[PDB]
Design a protein around this ligand. Structure first.
Ligand SMILES: Nc1ncnc2c1ncn2[C@@H]1O[C@H](COP(=O)(O)OP(=O)(O)O)[C@@H](O)[C@H]1O
Ligand SMILES: Nc1ncnc2c1ncn2[C@@H]1O[C@H](COP(=O)(O)OP(=O)(O)O)[C@@H](O)[C@H]1O
Ligand SMILES: Nc1ncnc2c1ncn2[C@@H]1O[C@H](COP(=O)(O)OP(=O)(O)O)[C@@H](O)[C@H]1O
Ligand SMILES: [Zn+2]
Lengths: 55, 433, 589, 315, 125
């Protein structure tokens, strides 16, 4: 749905994820996934001060 | 075919509520009724091509949503916080002291605002009539005393708040309106302010100034919790389950302390009976109250003075919230919503004696002194506010402590509305309560 | 994909819309009166053939429903038959705005014009009713059928009629009504003119006199008007409560004391002002109107008098003549600065940041001096409390006053800061947001107790004029008074000034008392501190030292020095300062 | 032109020259197309007896002759003649109107003078109390249904701009109708704020009013202000209020009887209007320094007897 | 909030007011000098008003003055009508080559500006 490859911010992704999980997912949960597989997602920070993740 | 309108509490200032047309297909009809809050999934497209193109120059179309599926939610991590505070010491006092942090005193209003936010438990006996759970508050006082600012605070804190004014509203603008529809060619009805506030709160500022025809609609709204209309050949009834908070002014702009409430306002007595809490605020001068009030206000203005950065600002705002209120406000908004949605506290028959005996004692004093006869609706009001007090603690059963505070609020309002000669006699007779 | 130009150096009024400029780029200014709901507009359509399955794309419309004139494939002979595509076609947002000529554009007493402006793309919803918007775009002509039936020979084409009317297509929308932002938009020379108008000692005194310089006396009102036009600071409480920052004023007096002159001054000076009077006004015309909208089957809000006066001053004459049924509609805008509408499905809340400057006359048409201030007025507590200032002025048969009054009113028939210089000051001053000092809070609660004490009735504890709103008014007035100068810290002095103006509801009288408060406190200070004694001459020399800068020349020195001893003798004459035998002066009981 | 009106067509650089409510002189061509008579406006204008005037200018009985000439059918009333004549002369507007009220018993020459005034002044309007309304003197402003512009449908105080409006039974004017006079009489504007319309007009004119005494006849036992049904704010605006009293003295009744009876058996108006039209066009007096002091002292003395509002000083 | 009790300069305060008197006129002259420069530099942002969307000589000074005030009315530094006259008249003095002024009925008409290198002249003052 995005015409550009810039990933959306985490503060949008987590609410969308939380509804699907039937359980609230927070920032610290993402770091658990990164520990298991380092190359799972790109974790570059947005200049707005919002965390981002991408394929 | 259905229209969807923005959330009442989220419209930005200066704009009318944005809305879209929605297309519903077979097996998805009658899924919702006017006043419902729903979430729908569908396709967003333009479909007014055809006759509009040649109808006029620079022709235009409209956007619609083809409703594929419509739906009408908490997590345990949040309940980890709600349950903790629910059993803390003085939970009721933390709630009341957090209502309108920058307003001094008026604690009998703040407790009335708090109870009206949480509300009671509606009941519908099959084959009999229903019972409302909404708490009705009337704020009558002299100019000043921030009666209007309270309704502005209720607007932001409550979930679904609809704000109205006595003179700025109309009979059509409250009950319903009529629109044409070319698709089916029969008249369609669009709801007013009372229909919007269904399962919400309806605020009527300056309640006295509206005409009796406008005021008659409000009375039947609180009594029946529904809107009945027969206009343009449409006869139907809509759900209007809303709580009312009203601010008014006495005759001549000053309250006559030597006359009853029933003789200080043009609001007729049958309409006064629809309220649960009747607050009568006086503004009488005294250096004791004036130094306290002024030093609160002069600090309120120096506080609200304008002047990971977002996190820093939220932390600083939280610090100021703590400095004036015991509970952070956005947490309280969540806290109230969870209590309203989840908790439905129930009565214990063990407290039947505590309720009936006080009522008979209150009735006995009514004929003894005073002109206002105690009515069953007062007892109905006591149970409702008793349920609301239990709903504050997130306890599924009514306790004796909640009933004591419930008795205190209703008796105090009834006593304070009496004339001065009768007022002093009743205060001594109900020193226990 | 759209392009939007802006920042045109010239702005053309509605009366400058002429057919000689069709197709050119121009910028106009006009107060918005109506807005319509946005709709998508077909920008570039596509079609598929009927005889064959050919497809035609990139069909630009250009203000008319243009179907393709030919099938592009030579194997097909189709013409004037097409199927409109709703998927490969593109749509664009489109909105119609009705704007109106400003008051300052047209000569006084003339009618204002009207015009319809078209918005596309992101520019939609940027126009709000009551806003003084400015548009940038080009002039176009649209098909029109209203021109038929008019006199004159009508052109024809061959037969087809080709009447037209002019409309404006705006590609850009801006709404126009912090110190560092403001200072960055001005050059050095604008600063120097503005800097020198602030960096002077008597600036507050001069600006009071500059209000309506042709009107004699009434220094009380000339202070009031200056403060109302400066306004206060709007504040929002953390719990979600909005604090009003605008000042309301009312003036009542003799039918010959000039009060309609003040209102005519303000509406002729205030950047956004509306004049209305008594019975000629109505409820709908003041706040906002619910009226059927064009282009659709729904309603819309049409701006009232107050909405046009947003961020300005609304002036009402003959306020006591206004019916109660329409005085009510002013209430909500005076305190909450918002308008609540619930009628015909237009449920909304509108900004009403307006300062009301009303004028009225006593109940009997004359100030019956046999009665109190209550018997002279028909206004009640709900409306009286909302005025931060409430002046009642009187005229009486003083001989010297009438000679001065007659002298000035005749010089008009025979014939310190210019009105332009004030608008270059208030715009800068309005950017300051003063803060209360800690001791000012202590001093404010002192004075509020004092005002509440005086307003207290003799038997009942209920007050009538001073309420909690007035406590805010003291800060609100003190803000504006401080806002007139280069300080963001409210001093105790500015609290006293607001205290005086709210409570008030040979040698010149002002000079006499000003000398009194200076000398009297001087003696009480040294007595309470036990300093050494001083003589009358030393008192005179001390006072002249305090006002060194007010002396224009040493010739004025002797006059003021001579004037000083008369003040002393008056105090001794009525034993205000007791002589002790050269003599020493001590406060009398 | 008259209450008839016909449509006009304007082209080219003659736009931006006319607005609603203006007075125009038109030179144009009369046309007709099917019937629709209209004017192709070709131009738009928006703005020997001299010795004979001097011969009357320097005469000694000038004031008496002019005063007498206005009402040859009315006896004496010298002061009434002068002020109403001074009403026609008017003040001097600068970068001016004088209003008069006649109070007297309901049998003395009140109606006849007002009839003369509107039949001797250009485009005067004759009005009465119950014969008019609030939108009678005030032009009915409305908005066009197809062009959406603001239009005005004229009014008594708008028709007589620059002229004289005659109001009979000025006491019996409705309170709402009486209320709108204040702005008209002092500011010469009519501001209207209604649904969708916010604008102000100009109605610069002179008002001549006649009022019957309270009750049946003037009673000297009550004060002067109690025999007049006007509140002081309205009563202060009038430049001149004439108390016309009916005596029973034959030393003046018989002379009046002769003047009336000599008129039903079997300067001129053209000179008078020529005189008036010349003065209003060419004479622009300026108050001298010496005359300044007299105005000051007269008002001070009048004020010192304590209703001497400053509206009487400009009068 | 108060001032000196007894300054050493007591009789010399007469010289103090004399010294104020000696330069009272100079301060007013600088007020005059500064205010014209406020108009002398503002004219730079004024010849862009005429150059942009004005197209003929028949434009009179009354119509231009009302246009200038309305263009700067919305800005942070608005300008009055009588100030615009000294602005419009100021242009012709510094631009005697492209604008000429002649009078009819006692009013002024503005000849059609041939705007060329408008910016260079303002620096020669
Ligand atoms: N009891 C109070 N404590 C603190 N501030 C108050 C109180 N009453 C009024 N105010 C001040 O007055 C304003 C409220 O006035 P308003 O809403 O007009 O009262 P009402 O509408 O009831 O007459 C608020 O801005 C508030 O700061
Ligand atoms: N201080 C003054 N200086 C100059 N003129 C004055 C002064 N006071 C009154 N006037 C004159 O008196 C008139 C007052 O009219 P006004 O009181 O406004 O009428 P209303 O009471 O109907 O509004 C004005 O036209 C003005 O010219
Ligand atoms: N001083 C006078 N000179 C001439 N005619 C007079 C005089 N006084 C009374 N009349 C006559 O008395 C009649 C009164 O009529 P008029 O003045 O028109 O109305 P009203 O009866 O209301 O005063 C007139 O017809 C007039 O001829
Ligand atoms: Zn084909």
């Amino acid at each position: 749905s995005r015409s550009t490859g810039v990933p959306p911010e985490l503060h949008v992704l987590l609410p969308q994820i939380s509804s699907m999980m039937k359980r609230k997912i927070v920032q610290d949960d993402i770091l658990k996934l990164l520990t298991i597989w380092s190359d799972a997602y790109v974790v570059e920070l947005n200049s707005r001060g919002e965390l981002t993740m991408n394929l | 075919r259905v229209t969807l309108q923005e959330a009442p509490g989220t419209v930005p200032p200066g704009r009318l509520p944005r809305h879209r047309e929605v297309i519903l297909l077979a097996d998805l009809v009658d899924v919702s009724k006017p006043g419902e809050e729903v979430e729908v999934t569908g396709i967003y497209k333009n479909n007014y091509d055809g006759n509009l193109n040649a109808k006029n120059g620079f022709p235009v179309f409209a956007t619609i949503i083809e409703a594929n599926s419509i739906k009408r939610s908490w997590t345990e991590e949040e309940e980890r916080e709600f349950r903790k505070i629910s059993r803390d010491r003085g939970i009721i006092d933390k709630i009341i002291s957090s209502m309108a942090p920058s307003i001094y005193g008026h604690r009998d209003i703040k407790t009335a605002v708090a109870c009206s936010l949480f509300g009671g438990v509606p009941k519908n006996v099959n084959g009999k009539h229903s019972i409302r759970g909404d708490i009705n508050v009337l704020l009558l006082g002299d100019p000043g005393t921030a009666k209007s600012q309270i309704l502005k605070y209720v607007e932001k804190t409550a979930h679904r708040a609809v704000f109205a004014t006595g003179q700025g509203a109309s009979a059509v603008g409250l009950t319903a309106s009529v629109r044409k529809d070319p698709i089916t060619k029969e008249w369609t009805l669009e709801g007013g302010a009372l229909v919007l506030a269904d399962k919400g709160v309806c605020l009527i500022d300056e309640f006295d100034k509206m005409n009796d025809q406008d005021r008659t609609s409000i009375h039947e709204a609180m009594e029946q919790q529904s809107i009945s209309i027969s206009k343009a050949g449409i006869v139907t009834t809509l759900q209007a389950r809303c709580s009312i908070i009203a601010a008014a002014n006495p005759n001549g702009g000053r309250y006559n302390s030597t006359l009853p409430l029933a003789q200080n306002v043009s609001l007729t007595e049958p309409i006064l009976s629809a309220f649960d809490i009747l607050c009568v605020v006086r503004d009488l001068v005294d250096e004791e109250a004036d130094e306290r009030l002024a030093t609160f206000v002069v600090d309120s203005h120096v506080r609200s003075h304008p002047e990971n950065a977002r996190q820093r600002r939220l932390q600083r705002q939280r610090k100021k919230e703590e400095e004036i209120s015991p509970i952070p406000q956005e947490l309280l908004m969540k806290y109230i919503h969870y209590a309203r949605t989840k908790i439905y506290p129930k009565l214990h028959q063990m407290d039947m004696d505590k309720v009936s005996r006080v009522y008979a004692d209150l009735r006995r004093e009514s004929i003894s002194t005073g002109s206002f006869p105690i009515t069953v609706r007062h007892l109905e009001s006591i149970l409702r506010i008793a349920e609301s007090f239990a709903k504050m603690r997130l306890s599924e059963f009514v306790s004796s402590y909640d009933l004591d505070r419930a008795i205190k609020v209703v008796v105090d309002s009834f006593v304070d509305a009496q004339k001065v000669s009768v007022r002093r006699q009743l205060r001594r007779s109900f020193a226990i309560y | 994909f759209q392009i939007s130009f802006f920042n045109l150096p010239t702005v053309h009024r509605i009366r400058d819309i002429r057919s000689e400029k069709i197709g050119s780029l121009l910028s106009i200014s006009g107060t918005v009166t109506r807005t319509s709901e946005v709709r998508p507009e077909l920008y570039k359509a596509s079609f598929t053939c009927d005889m064959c399955r050919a497809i035609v794309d990139n069909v630009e419309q250009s203000f008319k429903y243009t179907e393709p004139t030919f099938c592009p494939n030579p194997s097909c002979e189709n013409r004037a038959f097409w199927t409109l595509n709703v998927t490969r076609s593109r749509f664009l947002d489109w909105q119609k705005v009705r704007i109106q000529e400003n008051a300052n554009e047209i000569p006084t007493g003339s009618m204002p014009r009207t015009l319809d402006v078209i918005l596309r793309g992101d520019s939609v919803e940027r126009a709000k009713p009551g806003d003084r918007c400015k548009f940038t775009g080009v002039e176009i002509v649209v098909p029109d059928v209203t021109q038929l039936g008019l006199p004159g020979v009508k052109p024809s084409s061959t037969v087809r009629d080709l009447t037209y009317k002019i409309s404006f297509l705006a590609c850009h929308v801006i709404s126009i009504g912090d110190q560092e932002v403001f200072l960055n938009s001005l050059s050095s020379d604008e600063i120097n003119e503005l800097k020198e108008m602030v960096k002077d000692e008597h600036i507050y005194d001069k600006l009071v006199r500059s209000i309506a310089p042709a009107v004699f006396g009434h220094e009380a009102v000339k202070k009031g008007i200056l403060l109302q036009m400066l306004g206060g600071v709007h504040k929002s409480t953390v719990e979600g409560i909005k604090l009003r920052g605008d000042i309301n004023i009312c003036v009542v007096g003799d039918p010959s004391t000039s009060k309609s002159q003040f209102l005519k001054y303000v509406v002729g000076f205030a950047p956004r002002s509306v004049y209305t009077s008594g019975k000629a006004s109505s409820a709908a015309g003041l706040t906002a109107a619910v009226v059927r909208d064009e282009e659709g089957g729904d309603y819309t809000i049409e701006a009232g008098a107050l909405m046009l006066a947003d961020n300005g001053i609304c002036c009402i004459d003959e306020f006591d003549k206004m019916d109660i049924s329409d005085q009510v509609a002013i209430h909500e805008a005076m305190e909450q600065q918002t308008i609540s509408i619930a009628k015909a499905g237009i449920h909304a809340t509108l900004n009403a940041r307006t300062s009301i400057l009303a004028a009225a006359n006593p109940v009997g048409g004359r100030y019956n001096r046999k009665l109190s201030l209550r018997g002279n007025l028909n206004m009640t507590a709900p409306i009286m409390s909302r005025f931060d200032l409430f002046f009642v002025i009187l005229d009486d048969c003083n001989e010297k006053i009438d000679t001065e009054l007659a002298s000035h009113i005749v010089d008009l028939h025979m014939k310190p800061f210019s009105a332009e210089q004030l608008r270059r000051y208030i715009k800068y001053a309005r950017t300051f947001k003063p803060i209360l000092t800690k001791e000012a809070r202590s001093y404010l609660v002192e004075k509020y107790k004092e005002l509440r004490k005086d307003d207290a009735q003799g038997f009942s504890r209920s007050s009538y004029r001073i309420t909690v709103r007035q406590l805010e008014s003291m800060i609100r007035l003190s803000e504006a008074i401080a806002r007139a100068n280069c300080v963001d810290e409210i001093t105790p002095s500015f609290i006293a000034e607001a205290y005086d103006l709210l409570r008030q509801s040979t040698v010149t009288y002002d000079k006499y008392v000003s000398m009194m408060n200076m000398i009297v406190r001087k003696i009480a200070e040294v007595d309470r501190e036990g300093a050494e004694e001083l003589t009358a001459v030393d008192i005179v020399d001390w006072y002249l030292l305090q006002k060194e800068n007010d002396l224009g020349s040493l010739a004025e020195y002797w006059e003021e020095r001579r004037l000083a001893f008369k003040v002393i003798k008056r105090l001794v004459k009525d034993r205000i300062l007791m002589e002790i035998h050269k003599t020493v002066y001590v406060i009398h009981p | 032109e008259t209450p008839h009106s016909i449509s006009l067509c304007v082209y080219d650089e003659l736009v931006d020259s006319c607005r609603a409510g203006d007075r125009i002189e038109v030179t144009g061509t009369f046309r007709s197309i099917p019937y629709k008579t209209y004017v192709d406006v070709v131009h738009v204008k928006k703005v020997q007896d001299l010795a004979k005037i001097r011969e009357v200018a320097a005469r000694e009985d000038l004031y008496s002759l002019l005063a007498r000439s206005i009402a040859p059918s009315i006896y004496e009333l010298e002061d009434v003649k002068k002020g109403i004549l001074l009403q026609l002369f008017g003040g001097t507007n600068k970068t001016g109107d004088i209003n008069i009220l006649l109070c007297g018993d309901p049998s003395t020459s009140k109606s006849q003078i007002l009839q003369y005034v509107h039949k001797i002044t250009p485009r005067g309007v004759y009005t009465s109390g119950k014969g008019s309304s609030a939108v009678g003197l005030t032009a009915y402003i409305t908005r066009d249904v197809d062009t959406k512009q603001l239009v005005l449908e004229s009014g008594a105080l708008v028709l007589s701009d620059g002229g004289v409006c005659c109001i009979d039974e000025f006491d019996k004017m409705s309170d709402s109708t009486r209320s709108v006079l204040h702005e008209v009489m002092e500011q010469q504007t009519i501001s209207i704020a209604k649904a969708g319309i916010i604008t102000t007009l100009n109605a610069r004119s002179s008002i001549l009013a006649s009022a019957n005494p309270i009750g049946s006849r003037y009673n000297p036992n009550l004060p002067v202000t109690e025999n007049i049904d006007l509140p002081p704010p309205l009563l202060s605006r009038f430049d001149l209020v004439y108390l016309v009293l009916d005596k029973v003295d034959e030393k003046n009744d018989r002379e009046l009887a002769k003047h009336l009876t000599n008129l039903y058996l079997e300067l001129p108006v053209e000179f008078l209007t020529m005189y008036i039209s010349y003065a209003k066009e060419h004479i622009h007096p300026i108050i001298t320094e010496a005359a300044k002091t007299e105005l000051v002292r007269a008002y001070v003395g009048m004020r010192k007897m304590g209703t001497a509002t400053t509206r009487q000083l400009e009068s | 909030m108060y001032k000196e009790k007894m300054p050493d300069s007591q009789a010399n305060l007469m010289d103090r007011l004399r010294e104020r008197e000696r330069r009272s006129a100079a301060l007013l002259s600088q007020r005059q000098k500064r205010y014209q420069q406020f108009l002398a530099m503002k004219m730079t942002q004024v010849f862009d008003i005429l150059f942009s969307l004005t197209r003929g000589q028949p434009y009179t000074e009354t119509y231009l003055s009302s246009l200038i005030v309305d263009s700067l009315q919305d800005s942070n530094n608005p300008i009055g009508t009588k100030e615009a006259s000294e602005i419009l008249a100021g242009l012709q003095g510094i631009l005697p080559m492209d604008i000429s002024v002649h009078q009819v009925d006692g009013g002024l008409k503005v000849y059609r500006w041939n705007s060329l290198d408008k910016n260079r002249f303002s620096k020669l003052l």
